Amino acid sequence: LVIDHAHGATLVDVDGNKYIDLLSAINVGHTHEKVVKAIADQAQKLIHYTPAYFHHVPGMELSEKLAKIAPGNSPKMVSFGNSGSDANDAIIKFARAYTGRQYIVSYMGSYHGSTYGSQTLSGSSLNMTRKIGPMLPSVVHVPYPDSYRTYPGETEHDVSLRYFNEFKKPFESFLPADETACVLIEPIQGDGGIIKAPEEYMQLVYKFCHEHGILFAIDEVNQGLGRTGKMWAIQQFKDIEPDLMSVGKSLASGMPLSAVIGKKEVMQSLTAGNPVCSAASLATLDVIEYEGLVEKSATDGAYAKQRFLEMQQRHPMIGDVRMWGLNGGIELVKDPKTKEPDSDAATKVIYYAFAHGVVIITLAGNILRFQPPLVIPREQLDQALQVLDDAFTAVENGEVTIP
Amino acid sequence: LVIDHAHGATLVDVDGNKYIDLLSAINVGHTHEKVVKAIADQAQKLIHYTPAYFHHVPGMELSEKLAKIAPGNSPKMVSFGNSGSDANDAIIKFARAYTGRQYIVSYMGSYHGSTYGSQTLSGSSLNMTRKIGPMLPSVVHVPYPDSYRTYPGETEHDVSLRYFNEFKKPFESFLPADETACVLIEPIQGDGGIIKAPEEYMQLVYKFCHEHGILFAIDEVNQGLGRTGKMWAIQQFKDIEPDLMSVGKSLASGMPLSAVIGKKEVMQSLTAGNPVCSAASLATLDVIEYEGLVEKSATDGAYAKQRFLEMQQRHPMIGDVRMWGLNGGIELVKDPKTKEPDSDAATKVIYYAFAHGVVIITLAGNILRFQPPLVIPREQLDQALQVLDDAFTAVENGEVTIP
Amino acid sequence: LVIDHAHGATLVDVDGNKYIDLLSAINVGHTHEKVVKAIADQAQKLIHYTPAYFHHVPGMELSEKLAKIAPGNSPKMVSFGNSGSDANDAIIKFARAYTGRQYIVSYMGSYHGSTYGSQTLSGSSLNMTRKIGPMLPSVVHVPYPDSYRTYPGETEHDVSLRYFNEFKKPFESFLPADETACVLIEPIQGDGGIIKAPEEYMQLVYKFCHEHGILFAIDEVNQGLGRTGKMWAIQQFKDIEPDLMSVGKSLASGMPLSAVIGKKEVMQSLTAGNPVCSAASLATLDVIEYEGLVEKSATDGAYAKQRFLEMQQRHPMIGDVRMWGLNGGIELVKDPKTKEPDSDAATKVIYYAFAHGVVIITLAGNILRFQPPLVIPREQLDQALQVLDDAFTAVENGEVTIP
Amino acid sequence: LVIDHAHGATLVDVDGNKYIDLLSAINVGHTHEKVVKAIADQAQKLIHYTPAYFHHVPGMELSEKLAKIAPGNSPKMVSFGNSGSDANDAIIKFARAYTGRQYIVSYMGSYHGSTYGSQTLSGSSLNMTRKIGPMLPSVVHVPYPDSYRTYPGETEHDVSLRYFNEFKKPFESFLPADETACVLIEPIQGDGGIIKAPEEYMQLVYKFCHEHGILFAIDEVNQGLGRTGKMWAIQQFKDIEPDLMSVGKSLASGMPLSAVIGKKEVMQSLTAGNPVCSAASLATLDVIEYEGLVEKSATDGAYAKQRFLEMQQRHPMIGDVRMWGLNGGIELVKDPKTKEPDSDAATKVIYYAFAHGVVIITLAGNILRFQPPLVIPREQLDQALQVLDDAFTAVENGEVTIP
């Protein structure tokens, strides 16, 4: 299929068919009027310049704003790239350079990018890593805490301790803490299934890092910029200021711009952004702030969560409803007690939806990924929610078949 | 300093000062009317979309065009990124995947990017590699042929054989040819000093690769899209069709878009581009074709070469004039016979120029990098050339001092 | 201190003080009469020869014997080195070469050697890895099953499933099974604390390997040659034939000789031994066979286990008694219920023992390592056991202080 | 074939056929009476002991002697292994640990061992590296100076400058000098063809290392212990004290013992030897000293060199005669002016010799390796030399055919 154009949460194919976008670099929705104008005004003045002798204003303005909105009060610096991948690659460099150490710890289930560094940190789609090794050396992966498929009787405190214990094992065997430059964590894993780490777990890792001189880095490529109902996913957690943070194309409404924002002394251990993409980004941040999208995601998120929890009541194929902001994973299982994945039911849901004007896809075969643009109007949100309920019903009753 | 706007080969700072741009993602010049309009028209329809269920038209059109204009007649496929760095990273993957081998050979003096893969292939600025290792494994660097500082009495044939002999040594010691996935070469090194490899040398390497099943890959990030007076720098060489080729932001007039273009069977061994940047790229290629910029670079290049060779006659500090298209390296030496670098004279030249409205910079301390936009009007080209002649004179007579 | 000489399980310092050896390349005891004579007879004929045109007989004889006694019935080949380290390094090569794959999986807690390959596989003493990285690429570590410090209520089946689940996580995230050349496991970890893997766990890993084309390799450097009461530690497990197996200096009574013994087709994927050390090894194997040391270790092992389990009854500082053959780990804890390690009590035990003519040391601060020579006479075994009981008493009553 | 026994420079197969040994861990010859007795006396007292609480005397004595005889006057420490491979692996660790840097530079043509570290440093037989990668990261290879196949008109000074220039290129491109822990060099390459580096070349590299804080390490596994007519091959060079040096099994007459001997402060940056092998080594060093083998190799070496240079006069297939001590490479070429290798003539020479009771082999197809035991009696040396002359004649006249 072929998309012609889009606006807000609506996609329009070449034959004029309309769909509701449930899928992300689209926090502010498609073709926001302010972003369009920023791109157009800025292309008229300056598409590109090699930075040697000169600076541009959108760049310096954007840079100053991101330093401020970044989590915590410690002074920051900002380094621009073109995508998540190259930002996460840079995090490795910044961390190594600053600490003089070489190991990096990253999580199983994570997705950090497709360049050799960020790919090596990743733990999602090995297909991505097949036949392309060796990868970057001195990287270790540890398991990300899973709150759904747990052991019988486990509290959140059990799950936090158990996983923090897995975290330490490498450090108790072959990986010297004093030679680890940083830990990189998605405060909520996206490609992993919209899996959020328990609060205590994160405090343990954080305290561990500080106690052994290891930088604490986060990836907010998918979960930042209001997606969770706070500005930054890490703000779902109590009093945590990371040393380094990555941001992706969401920054510029899907135009290719990225950043790393870090504590000044870390960033001095070792560039400037596309001006048209910087324009788009200033407009984008303005829309998030003035349209109150952080708050909107929180409020609609809580709404969505209730709507999904109620659908779950009539629809046992819904194993788990996870939602923080308009950010959710609706995990389908063949049976509530075994939690067996039902990739087949999920495929059926998205094809039904698709067929009724709702665009959505999955993670890990069986989890629906719900991340509509934050600007989504309540009417469309409700249409889409209804179509989904319907989809569950059709599938429940065997009324859905994929060609 | 701060740039406000630019058009063609003219930069304009915030105080309305004008400069002539001698510096590259600017083949078609600044703010070309067609590129501006493509960006603006396309932002109105679609800034970004996640590609899952949908394709966009600019993407498919761009893709088809690049398949065709790419060097050789073998069917091609095209894979899009956001920059040179991530394209060169991909070249590694594509090569490995296809061949099932792991080693990669790259050249000393090269610059391929700043992500961990392309950075590891690079051989220019170790500063870039300081404190950030380990780099990517299974990469070997070999020396790039230097035609200026050669041994007494050396012909182009001597230089070609000598360097091809260095090339083979690894293969005769620790690097098994049958385990090398590819060789990546800039047909003319850019960051290296605008150093072009001798024709015979390139045939040797090429034939070597084919004879041992090694993919032959080129980087045209800096030297492609008409910069040399042919479409692709590799076209300066007789009957060479690479297996893989990288292209950078020049593709979209400095908007963040890249590509790898390769033989179909290689590319099947293992994405889609930003639509606004794809729009910019279609406009950009159209300008190169209809404005005859390939031919223009050839013709102005030959003009520039004569103008520099004549300046050299009155200015012995000019050791070497290298030029293929409007693509040149004007290498300054303290003495014609010793060839000692004179980084100091070069710094003085650029500061004089700067002060007389000409923006230019250096490579390796002492080489002037001449790569103005291809659309440069002859009047400005001549102004800039004159200012340079002047600069040589001032510096010759000790009239130039840096604060 | 300085040792002058030794015989059986007795060490004698330069001042004629006698000690009982509880510490291993000493399966057959010190200075066995047959080993001494083999060394002496063979030194008279041939200390060393470069193998080019010639073979030696001890070498071919030793080779044929080890092929036969190795676990399983599949034809084998034997490749000789000088130590465990270089045998485990070779296992990596053999595995890679044969499979055409690159990743290797090894266990946390393991000790495989001190050369860069075997060191990278290791998971015991990071001190060993401090400041010497980067290590060898494409190695992943997983946790070795711990049967003592487990979760409340865990059966052996829980522990087996839980740990096999940790094993799979890498394979479910970033490590492609089809690109893993082998898994290397100590059927009982030695440096790790004399920790034996549960039977079901091992069947799972084994079946996993076979199902994904991964070679199953074992380290018997510490636990082979009758140490466990079977010839090979892997024989404690039902019907398991490894693809590769490493053996260390025990082979030649601590003379420097090692081997890898593997399935013929694996070993053809890609040397010969010191003749004097091969002589020592033939004598050594003869002593193990005719003196019935496999059986002796089993019988004395069961005796030792009862004697330790009874000491545990009066000595609660003994948290865990682990023993398979004359191969044991007597783990000291500050409290039976918390299992807190008591490194301090252990240090006190060995100093008491030492002072009463018993040489023994620890693993992980708090575990006594019991591995006397297999030939140990029952009288000495009993003396040493008694001294230990005493040591526990002294320490219990605060009668022991380290200078 | 099968060797039964040997003594001095004589090998004896199982059928009582005698051969003269021209091939090395055999500096003192086969079965020297003193070495045999040391092995036998020491096996009677102590074959092996785990070093924890105890030291042995042969170990401390050997250690003290090697500290003293090592090149230079700076205090030294000695660390023992079982072979060249594991000594060269350790050199990497020692160097890294001390400097806090990670890169290592090693030479094309070199052979340092077969464990993953020393193998990665090696540059001789890629077969050894086929299908076993990835190798150890952060290693770079540079070319070893070749004095035979040089460019027309080159002096030793040209060859020294040219090669030192190749040495620097990496450092001028991608390899930061301040991040290189050491350079490891064979002062005369053995497996490479008995190729000795020019004096000036070595001073340049040495001075380079000192000027950039890089440790200067040498391999004397093949060329040490009097092989060159000085104790250590590095003593062929003016006033050079290495930071680290490796020694192999020659130390103990082919018993498995190795060492690293280094400047004390380097060695403190981060074991003990087999007592029977340490005994053999003390005897071995005594034989070298009292039998004047350093001097003998010098004198016989000069004799051998004249005898080969004269054979060359009647035998043009001898391209190059290289000899320093009883250490030589007699390189066969198809034509004196082209220097084409004649692997075929070499194979014929060794088969003729073999057939007339002389054991010798080749390097690189066409170079005869001459390294008889140093104790060789002049009568046998002369027999063997004569047989070789004969061999050249037979081959010259087409009288030699391999089955």
From Swiss-Prot, chains A, B, C, D:
Subunit structure: Homotetramer.
Entry's pH dependence statement: Optimum pH is 5.0 for the forward reaction, and 6.0 for the reverse reaction.
Name of a matching Pfam family: Aminotran_3
NCBIfam families, A to Z: PRK08593.1
Temperature dependence: Optimum temperature is 50 degrees Celsius for the forward reaction, and 45 degrees Celsius for the reverse reaction.
CDD domains given in the database record: OAT_like
EC numbers for this chain: 5.1.1.21
GO MF annotation terms: identical protein binding; isomerase activity; pyridoxal phosphate binding; transaminase activity
Keywords, in A-Z order: Isomerase, Pyridoxal phosphate
PANTHER family membership: AMINOTRANSFERASE CLASS III, LEUCINE_METHIONINE RACEMASE
InterPro entries membership: Aminotrans_3 (IPR005814), Aminotrans_3_PPA_site (IPR049704), Class-III_PLP-dep_AT (IPR050103), PyrdxlP-dep_Trfase (IPR015424), PyrdxlP-dep_Trfase_major (IPR015421), PyrdxlP-dep_Trfase_small (IPR015422)
Stated role: Catalyzes the epimerization of L-isoleucine to D-allo-isoleucine and D-allo-isoleucine to L-isoleucine. Can also catalyze the racemization of many nonpolar amino acids, including leucine and valine. Does not have GABA aminotransferase activity.
Record's catalysed reaction(s): L-isoleucine = D-allo-isoleucine
Ligand binding (pyridoxal 5'-phosphate): 84-85, 111, 219-222
Gene3D superfamilies: Aspartate Aminotransferase, domain 1 (3.90.1150.10), Type I PLP-dependent aspartate aminotransferase-like (Major domain) (3.40.640.10)
Modified residues (N6-(pyridoxal phosphate)lysine): 249
Cofactor(s) the protein requires to work: pyridoxal 5'-phosphate
Designated name of the protein: Isoleucine 2-epimerase
Stored PROSITE patterns: AA_TRANSFER_CLASS_3 (PS00600)
Organism: Lentilactobacillus buchneri (Lactobacillus buchneri)
Family stated for the protein in its record: Belongs to the class-III pyridoxal-phosphate-dependent aminotransferase family.
